[PDB]
Amino acid sequence: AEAPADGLKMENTKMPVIFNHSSHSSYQCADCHHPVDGKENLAKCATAGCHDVFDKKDKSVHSYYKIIHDRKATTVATCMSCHLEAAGSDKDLKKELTGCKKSKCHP
Ligand code: HEC
Ligand code: HEC
Ligand code: HEC
Ligand code: HEC
Ligand code: MOO
Numbered sequence: 001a002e003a004p005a006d007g008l009k010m011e012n013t014k015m016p017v018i019f020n021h022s023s024h025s026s027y028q029c030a031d032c033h034h035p036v037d038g039k040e041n042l043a044k045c046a047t048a049g050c051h052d053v054f055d056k057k058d059k060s061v062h063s064y065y066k067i068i069h070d071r072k073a074t075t076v077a078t079c080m081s082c083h084l085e086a087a088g089s090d091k092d093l094k095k096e097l098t099g100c101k102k103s104k105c106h107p
Contacts, residue, residue: 001029003025006021012046015106034075050062051064
């Protein structure tokens with residue numbers, strides 16, 4: 001399938017983020033849209049039964065906060081864990097890519 005246009009809003013929370021597929025088009029679709037039950041899975045992350053727990057303290061697979069903000073990952077990358085690798089030791093990239101505010105995720 002085809003990546004959607006840029007400027008997509010992730011707005012399940014009071015701290016929404018703009019996701020641009022163009023900034024991520026060197027990654028395989030399934031790197032984020034991981035298959036579920038052996039079928040292609042393009043459903044929104046916080047779909048009921050999926051990543052639908054919004055408690056930030058929740059560490060279960062259902063935590064919406066975890067799958068985005070976890071600094072470490074193994075099987076599927078988080079937003080954070082990949083960006084921490086890309087920013088690395090770099091000062092400005094850490095700011096743009098990994099910061100909690102004044103970043104490109106959370107301006
Ligand atoms: C981009 C890679 C991000 C960085 C860097 C940080 N966060 Fe984030 N955040 C991101 C997304 C995609 C979302 C969900 C957007 C939506 O509304 O659908 C969030 C949301 C949050 C929230 C609200 C969570 C909730 O209310 O359930 C918080 C409190 C939050 N983010 C905090 C946070 C902190 C503390 C960070 C620094 C360590 C940080 N974010 C970075 C994406 C990204
Ligand atoms: C990780 C960095 C991703 C890669 C690589 C690709 N996509 Fe994606 N996509 C990603 C996120 C965080 C979201 C928002 C989901 C949400 O819960 O809001 C999306 C969204 C889509 C959608 C849905 C668009 C809509 O109008 O709801 C589609 C159809 C989609 N993405 C397709 C897609 C394809 C085909 C990709 C490979 C070429 C691809 N994406 C890459 C994260 C990531
Ligand atoms: C419901 C059918 C889901 C949707 C839609 C999305 N995910 Fe998911 N996720 C789901 C399951 C059943 C699992 C179990 C483990 C597996 O690899 O199948 C996961 C796992 C993840 C993880 C790893 C979490 C962990 O505990 O280490 C991540 C980081 C993740 N998923 C991300 C993710 C994103 C970004 C999604 C939207 C684009 C998304 N998932 C959709 C169930 C479902
Ligand atoms: C690695 C596999 C990544 C994952 C998973 C996510 N992102 Fe990412 N992102 C990645 C790189 C290497 C870059 C720099 C490339 C560039 O074109 O600048 C980015 C960039 C962003 C940005 C900044 C630019 C922009 O599109 O506004 C944002 C806001 C961003 N990425 C958000 C984001 C979110 C919310 C993710 C989780 C769903 C996520 N990215 C995953 C690498 C990777
Ligand atoms: O944006 Mo919230 O009210 O911490 O789930």
